[PDB]
Amino acid sequence: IVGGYTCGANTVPYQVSLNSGYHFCGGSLINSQWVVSAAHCYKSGIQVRLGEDNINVVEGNEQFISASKSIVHPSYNSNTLNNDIMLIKLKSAASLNSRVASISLPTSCASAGTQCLISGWGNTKSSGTSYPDVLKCLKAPILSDSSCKSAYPGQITSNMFCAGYLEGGKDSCQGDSGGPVVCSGKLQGIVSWGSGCAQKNKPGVYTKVCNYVSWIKQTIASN
């Protein structure tokens, strides 16, 4: 997260870190046994780390649970990043409390202008590279589909939306991938892609979660 702020320990209780010997992506806990992330985060040997603040220090509220299975969206295209969504099932149910909690799925899509909270342990610099240890947060508005398409001609599908600031300076970034965009208490987005980070006229692009609620529910129901 570039141009954001320190969230505060466990203030984002649905935020997970996907770990394969090191943090490599974010994710969102959607019930005691399932995490939503980006398909581009797919890999084998994932351990899901819940209740994290400092990802380099055991602070007392963590739950580390191995993934038992991953399901990349059936229509994920790694070249276009269309349908950039994946489900991860935990080997055991997380113990849910104030600091480890699921986030509600949307029942309708969000509109341009809605404010959202975007969070992660990704790069904090738009030019250089600095990775934080504690969770970073950014409040950002959803942008109109027309401005999103104008920013990224030929690249924005009906399964994507832009959020952030066309002036630059405030954005998600590398390492935030797969993490949450939460708007009025609902998971509306997943950190997906962008050209650089916090660049002028290049806002963040997010997977449009409301399009996938049907697939998520039915997938969970049979797995």
Ligand SMILES: N=C(N)c1ccc(/C=N/NC(=O)c2cccnc2)cc1
């Ligand atoms: N501007 C955003 N909101 C944004 C931009 C980019 C990303 C993702 N980056 N990932 C990388 O660079 C990368 C990752 C692994 C290997 N090689 C390169 C997320 C958000």
Ligand SMILES: [Ca+2]
């Ligand atoms: Ca920790």
